[PDB]
Amino acid sequence: ILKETEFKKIKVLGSGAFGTVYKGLWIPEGEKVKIPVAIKELREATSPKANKEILDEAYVMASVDNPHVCRLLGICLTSTVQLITQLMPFGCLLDYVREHKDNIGSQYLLNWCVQIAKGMNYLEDRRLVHRDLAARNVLVKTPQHVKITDFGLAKLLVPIKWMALESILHRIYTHQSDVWSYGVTVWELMTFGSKPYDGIPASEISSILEKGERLPQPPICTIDVYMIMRKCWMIDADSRPKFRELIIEFSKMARDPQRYLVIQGDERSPTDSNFYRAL
Numbered sequence: 001i002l003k004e005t006e007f008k009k010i011k012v013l014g015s016g017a018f019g020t021v022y023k024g025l026w027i028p029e030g031e032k033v034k035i036p037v038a039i040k041e042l043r044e045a046t047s048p049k050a051n052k053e054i055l056d057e058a059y060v061m062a063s064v065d066n067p068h069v070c071r072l073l074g075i076c077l078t079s080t081v082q083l084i085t086q087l088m089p090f091g092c093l094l095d096y097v098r099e100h101k102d103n104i105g106s107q108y109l110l111n112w113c114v115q116i117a118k119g120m121n122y123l124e125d126r127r128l129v130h131r132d133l134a135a136r137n138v139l140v141k142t143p144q145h146v147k148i149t150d151f152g153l154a155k156l157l158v159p160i161k162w163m164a165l166e167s168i169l170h171r172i173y174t175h176q177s178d179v180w181s182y183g184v185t186v187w188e189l190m191t192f193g194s195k196p197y198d199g200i201p202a203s204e205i206s207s208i209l210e211k212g213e214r215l216p217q218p219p220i221c222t223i224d225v226y227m228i229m230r231k232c233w234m235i236d237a238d239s240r241p242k243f244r245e246l247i248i249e250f251s252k253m254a255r256d257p258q259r260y261l262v263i264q265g266d267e268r269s270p271t272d273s274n275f276y277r278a279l
């Protein structure tokens with residue numbers, strides 16, 4: 001809980017179902033420096049009880065660090081709450097894959113799959129369920145390092161095309177329904193940011209899933225990769241993969257990436273890679 005007077009919103013970065021994200025500046029009290037931060041200002045007013053719930057839930061998730069999960073760094077208790085996290089200059093992975101649609105290699109796509117599975121497995125080990133995993137909620141720290149944002153905002157504050165059937169029908173959320181959203185997240189990556197079930201209304205999604213219909217195989221995917229996605233969308237939650245199995249599977253694929261993804265010109269920066277690490 002920090003003083004609102006210390007944070008200044010300077011530029012809009014985007015928005016989600018709960019708020020507007022800004023690139024902000026932190027000016028510590030007594031100081032003249034401006035430290036860049038990311039601020040999400042919630043659209044709806046919230047009760048002090050709901051603010052305490054956000055802080056408590058963030059305190060438990062952030063008790064231990066995980067390199068692939070964003071932690072809530074601070075909060076400003078204004079008219080509407082302002083959540084503060086580390087600024088990710090590269091924005092979200094959904095926008096990143098759309099921008100680099102002609103320059104993304106199989107090695108990067110497969111590593112991002114491992115990283116998201118590692119961040120999701122960390123939440124599962126802590127018995128925490130995200131409820132809103134999507135490529136828009138995976139942020140890019142560097143092209144080699146992605147992190148999941150917005151943990152717990154869904155439960156505390158509806159993305160039908162990312163939800164497991166049991167979640168659509170009964171608002172049931174488990175680690176296995178997060179696995180279903182992981183499959184959809186992978187499908188967005190593998191199609192370079194396509195919209196799932198494009199042209200199908202959200203009201204028809206449950207029935208479409210009930211008939212056996214699923215997202216199609218992205219052109220770059222071998223059957224081995226698509227089969228893992230399909231298993232994430234099994235009606236029976238217990239038949240879907242576990243995040244630790246997904247980690248193993250995608251990590252195996254990442255060690256020989258051209259055997260699992262076929263991308264045009266895949267075979268074609270070392271200094272930038274080194275500098276990203278050093279910085």
Ligand SMILES: *CCC(=O)N1CC[C@H](n2cc(-c3ccncc3)c(-c3cccc(OCc4ccc5c(c4)CN(C)C5=O)c3)n2)C1
Pocket residue numbers: 013014015016021022038039040054055057058059061062070071072083084085086087088089091092093094095136137139149150151152153
């Ligand atoms: C590309 C899609 C897009 O535009 N988005 C807007 C919504 C979502 N997003 C992006 C960012 C962001 C952008 C740049 N740098 C950093 C972050 C955020 C964001 C911004 C500020 C604060 C945020 O807090 C998320 C958070 C993290 C942990 C926890 C909670 C909330 C609540 N809780 C209990 C936690 O443990 C997120 N949002 C993509």
